[PDB]
Structures are given as structure tokens and as C-alpha cells.
Design a protein around this ligand. Structure first.
Ligand SMILES: CCS(=O)(=O)Cc1cnc(Oc2ccc(F)cc2F)c(-c2cc(C)c3n2CC=NC3=O)c1
Length: 127
């Protein structure tokens, strides 16, 4: 029940790097999913307290949300686009695990994972 501490967004000793693709993940991919009608549930960590889901963090062990993605991008916390894409994947996977097919939150996710996959089909090249 009690809310764990969010995932970190800055880490002095982690190798950081700004690539063209990482720039794209924030400027085009993150910031177009953000505006979607179904983004809001995923714009910050899940508050198992506010929602009264004391079991969320007992089932979800790697939490992830577009809020901590947007914070990680803007902090250039990532080394390459793939680790940022992995955090999106974890976010969706989390939602399909704690929930079951047909739930409204899954519908929002399944959709967002569709929009996400369509937007990252074509990433920029490196200089
Ligand atoms: C994120 C801060 S917050 O204060 O908690 C706002 C918030 C409100 N409602 C939520 O659930 C629904 C969201 C839309 C629905 F149509 C129906 C929900 F039950 C959620 C939320 C986000 C995520 C990933 C999940 N949930 C709920 C259950 N499982 C989840 O995996 C979050």
C-alpha cells in the first residue's frame, strides 16, 4: 500500500549521452503520447494510495511512467534510445500484468503502445 520511492531521474555516476534519436524520443515521441486522451493515467507514477490499490507495488516490482521518462529524457539520463524505449516497454508490460484484458486502463495502454510503436518505427539517424 504505502507508496515506494519513484524511479530515479538523475544519477551522477551513470554514463549519459545525448543522441539525435534520444532527442527525437522526447521531442516527437514522448511529447505526442503526452497529449493523447489516454495519457493522463500514465503521466506520473501510480499512487497506490490515492487509488486504494494496496497490492500494486506488491505485484509491480519495476515501476515506470511517462512522467519519469520525461524527467529522464530532459535530464539526459539515458545513454541510447534503446534504454528509453525499454522504459516505455516496462510501463506497458506493467499495466498488462497487474490488470487483465478488457480493463479500461489496458485499453488506454494498448492504444498508447500502438501509437508508440507507430512513432518509433522510424527514428532519426546519427551524425
Ligand atoms: C498515476 C497517478 S494517479 O493518481 O494514480 C491517476 C490514476 C487514476 N486512475 C488510474 O487507473 C485508471 C486509469 C484510467 C481508467 F480508465 C481506469 C483506471 F482505473 C491510474 C492508473 C495508472 C496505471 C498505470 C494504472 N492505474 C490504475 C490501475 N492499474 C494501472 O496500471 C492512475
Amino acid at each position: 500500500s504505502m507508496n515506494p520511492p519513484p524511479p530515479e531521474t538523475s544519477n551522477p555516476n551513470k554514463p549519459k549521452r545525448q543522441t539525435n534519436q534520444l532527442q527525437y524520443l522526447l521531442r516527437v515521441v514522448l511529447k505526442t503520447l503526452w497529449k493523447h486522451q489516454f495519457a493522463w493515467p500514465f503521466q506520473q507514477p501510480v499512487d497506490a494510495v490515492k487509488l486504494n490499490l494496496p497490492d500494486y507495488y506488491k505485484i509491480i516490482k519495476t515501476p515506470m511512467d511517462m512522467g519519469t521518462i520525461k524527467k529522464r529524457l530532459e535530464n539526459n539520463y539515458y545513454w541510447n534510445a534503446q534504454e528509453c524505449i525499454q522504459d516505455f516497454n516496462t510501463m506497458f508490460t506493467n499495466c498488462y500484468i497487474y490488470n487483465k484484458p478488457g480493463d479500461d486502463i489496458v485499453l488506454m495502454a494498448e492504444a498508447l503502445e500502438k501509437l508508440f510503436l507507430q512513432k518509433i518505427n522510424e527514428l532519426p539517424t546519427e551524425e
